[PDB]
Design a protein around this motif. Structure first.
Motif, short mmCIF file in Angstrom:
data_model
loop_
_atom_site.label_atom_id
_atom_site.label_comp_id
_atom_site.label_asym_id
_atom_site.label_seq_id
_atom_site.Cartn_x
_atom_site.Cartn_y
_atom_site.Cartn_z
N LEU A 162 0.80 -1.22 0.00
CA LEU A 162 0.00 0.00 0.00
C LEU A 162 0.84 1.28 0.00
O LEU A 162 0.40 2.30 -0.52
CB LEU A 162 -0.97 -0.04 1.19
CG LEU A 162 -1.93 -1.24 1.19
CD1 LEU A 162 -2.96 -1.07 2.30
CD2 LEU A 162 -2.62 -1.41 -0.15
N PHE A 166 -0.76 3.44 -3.35
CA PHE A 166 -1.50 4.67 -3.19
C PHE A 166 -0.60 5.90 -3.27
O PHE A 166 -0.99 6.98 -2.83
CB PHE A 166 -2.32 4.61 -1.90
CG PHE A 166 -3.55 3.80 -2.08
CD1 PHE A 166 -4.67 4.39 -2.64
CD2 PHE A 166 -3.56 2.44 -1.86
CE1 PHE A 166 -5.82 3.64 -2.89
CE2 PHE A 166 -4.72 1.67 -2.10
CZ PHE A 166 -5.84 2.28 -2.62
N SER A 168 0.84 9.16 -5.15
CA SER A 168 0.34 10.18 -6.06
C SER A 168 1.58 10.69 -6.79
O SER A 168 2.25 11.61 -6.32
CB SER A 168 -0.39 11.29 -5.28
OG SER A 168 -1.05 12.17 -6.16
N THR A 227 -8.73 -4.76 -4.72
CA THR A 227 -9.11 -3.34 -4.65
C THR A 227 -9.85 -3.04 -3.36
O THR A 227 -9.64 -1.97 -2.76
CB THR A 227 -9.97 -2.94 -5.85
OG1 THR A 227 -11.14 -3.77 -5.94
CG2 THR A 227 -9.18 -3.09 -7.14
N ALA A 231 -8.28 -0.23 -0.98
CA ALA A 231 -9.00 1.00 -0.69
C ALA A 231 -9.52 1.02 0.74
O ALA A 231 -9.51 2.06 1.41
CB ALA A 231 -10.14 1.19 -1.69
N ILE A 234 -6.37 1.39 3.36
CA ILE A 234 -5.70 2.69 3.35
C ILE A 234 -6.65 3.78 3.83
O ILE A 234 -6.23 4.74 4.50
CB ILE A 234 -5.10 3.02 1.96
CG1 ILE A 234 -3.92 4.00 2.10
CG2 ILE A 234 -6.16 3.62 1.01
CD1 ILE A 234 -2.66 3.40 2.81
N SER A 235 -7.95 3.66 3.53
CA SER A 235 -8.89 4.72 3.86
C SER A 235 -9.23 4.70 5.35
O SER A 235 -9.25 5.75 6.00
CB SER A 235 -10.18 4.56 3.03
OG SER A 235 -9.89 4.67 1.62
N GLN A 383 -1.65 9.51 -1.87
CA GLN A 383 -3.07 9.83 -2.04
C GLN A 383 -3.78 10.09 -0.72
O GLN A 383 -4.94 10.54 -0.73
CB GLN A 383 -3.77 8.69 -2.80
CG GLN A 383 -3.31 8.62 -4.27
CD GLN A 383 -3.96 7.49 -5.04
OE1 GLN A 383 -5.15 7.23 -4.88
NE2 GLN A 383 -3.18 6.83 -5.91
N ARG A 384 -3.14 9.79 0.39
CA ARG A 384 -3.66 10.13 1.71
C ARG A 384 -2.62 10.95 2.45
O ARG A 384 -1.42 10.86 2.18
CB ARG A 384 -3.98 8.88 2.55
CG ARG A 384 -5.09 7.98 1.99
CD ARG A 384 -6.43 8.67 1.98
NE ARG A 384 -7.46 7.77 1.47
CZ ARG A 384 -7.68 7.56 0.18
NH1 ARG A 384 -6.98 8.21 -0.75
NH2 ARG A 384 -8.62 6.69 -0.19
#
Ligand code: HEM
Ligand code: YTT
Length: 394
Positions: A162, A166, A168, A227, A231, A234-235, A383-384
């Motif tokens: 992860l 994730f 960016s 997925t 998702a 990580i979220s 992304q986070r």
């Protein structure tokens, strides 16, 4: 002379930059440059963010088109940007939704037992403890292994992908493809494992052998597992981590929730509203010429929906920086998105945080940062927004 505004404004997840309020009042849709060099429209008021997310002519799947302006490089195959669309077209949406509900049997008790066990281990080791690496992320990982029906011991192996999956990034990432192909192969093996009979992967394994689904590809079944693990973990891990910072920074609120835990659901809803876990705006591609505020967005242009633009908008949430447990519109934030792509794991994400915070306040009511807040190291080009370590004492 200067350039166009560059996004993102800040990797820090503990405070919102002053630039957001100035943009919202003066130019709630404004041209910006992304890390790939592309131009995009940044939308930052509640009214305009909601308009964009509710208009299906702003497409998420078209962001993967060749030659489109890009927020960042893809870390998944382009067809996976349309993940939920592929799931619905295969007739699997209802099955996936019923597997990720927090109401599954034993699930809430499993979450409570796991949170307590993690916190007991930390208390035994003595302060300082790292609430991200030794609490929030293992709790998210354990939860998604249980929801998926895969062995708890395989969690850390899948988690290792992860920090790259994730990112960016302005350019493609060689390691992302290596990890993706390996994780897909793992999930393909799970489908052929007869001991996997529970959770999401247990249900998919049964549907795979049902005649009604004989023409669904094995690739899609494996992709759902990878997925939703990625998702989800990580979220939930990143949200809980930064919610804990907001709570630690507010000892009055921490004390109130400790004394009256029946207010924890309302507190978590405010912690979702003010959360800065998403590091970039949500991307959409215009499939038509569409008027947004004062700007005509042209077909083919990139629009970025800034969640903290909407969620801190004082026209919709008065005194937006304050956590208020009696707001009349408490779930009307955009922390889970809005419209076609509203987060399917919203209920699970709420319960993960509620139980994590409840357990923490029972075991660690005096929890405080062990370092000055400016010493937290915020992960960049990701992304986070998350601190690399979250050292606490109690
Ligand atoms: C607090 C925890 C979470 C937060 C804040 C969150 C946030 C979001 C947001 C804002 C979106 C919309 C993205 C967009 O419109 O571009 C989204 C979509 C999504 N989320 Fe969540 N999420 C959370 C937990 C989860 C969990 C637990 C799962 C699965 C187990 C999950 C899986 C997904 C998926 C698959 C999508 C894509 C939906 C679609 O394209 O229709 N998320 N999430
Ligand atoms: O591209 C996708 N990929 C996956 C999410 C995902 C992205 C990367 C990865 O390694 C795993 C899953 C999806 O379900 N839908 C879409 C949209 C998406 C992207 C990011 C996100 O946080 C939520 C949704």
């Amino acid at each position: 002379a200067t350039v166009l505004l560059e996004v993102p404004f800040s990797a820090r997840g503990d405070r919102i930059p002053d630039a957001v309020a100035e943009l919202r009042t003066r130019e709630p849709i404004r041209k910006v440059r992304t890390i790939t060099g592309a131009e995009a429209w940044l939308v930052s008021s509640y009214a305009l963010c909601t308009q964009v997310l509710e208009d299906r002519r702003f497409s998420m799947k078209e962001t993967a088109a060749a030659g489109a302006p890009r927020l960042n490089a893809l870390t998944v195959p382009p067809e996976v940007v349309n993940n939920m669309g592929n799931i619905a077209d295969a007739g699997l949406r209802k099955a996936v939704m019923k597997a990720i509900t927090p109401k599954a049997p034993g699930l809430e008790q499993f979450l409570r037992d796991t949170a307590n066990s993690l916190l007991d281990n930390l208390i035994t080791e003595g302060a300082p403890a790292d609430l991200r690496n030794d609490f929030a992320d293992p709790l998210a990982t354990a939860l998604h292994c249980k929801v998926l029906g895969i062995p708890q011991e395989d969690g850390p192996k899948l988690f290792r992908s992860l920090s790259i999956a994730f990112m960016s990034s302005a350019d493609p990432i060689p390691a992302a493809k290596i990890n993706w192909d390996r994780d897909i192969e793992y999930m393909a093996g799970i489908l052929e494992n007869p001991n996997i009979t529970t959770g999401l992967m247990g249900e998919l394994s049964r549907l795979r052998k049902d005649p009604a689904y004989s023409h669904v590809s094995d690739e899609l079944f494996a992709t759902i597992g990878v997925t939703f693990f990625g998702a989800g973990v990580i979220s939930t891990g990143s949200f809980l981590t930064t919610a804990l910072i907001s709570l630690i920074q507010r000892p009055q609120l921490r004390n109130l929730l400790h004394e009256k835990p029946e207010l924890i659901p309302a507190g978590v809803e405010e912690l979702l509203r003010i959360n800065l876990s998403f590091a970039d705006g949500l991307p959409r591609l215009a499939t038509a010429d569409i008027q947004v505020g004062d700007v005509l967005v042209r077909k083919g242009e990139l629009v970025l929906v800034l969640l903290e633009g909407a969620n801190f908008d004082p026209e919709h949430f008065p005194n937006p920086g304050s956590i208020e447990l009696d707001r009349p519109n408490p779930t009307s934030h955009l922390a889970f998105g809005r419209g076609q792509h509203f987060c399917p794991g919203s209920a699970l994400g709420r319960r993960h945080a509620q139980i994590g915070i409840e357990a923490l306040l029972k075991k660690m009511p005096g929890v405080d940062l062990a370092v000055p807040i400016d010493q937290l190291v915020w992960r960049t080009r990701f992304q986070r927004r998350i601190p690399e370590r979250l050292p606490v004492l109690w």
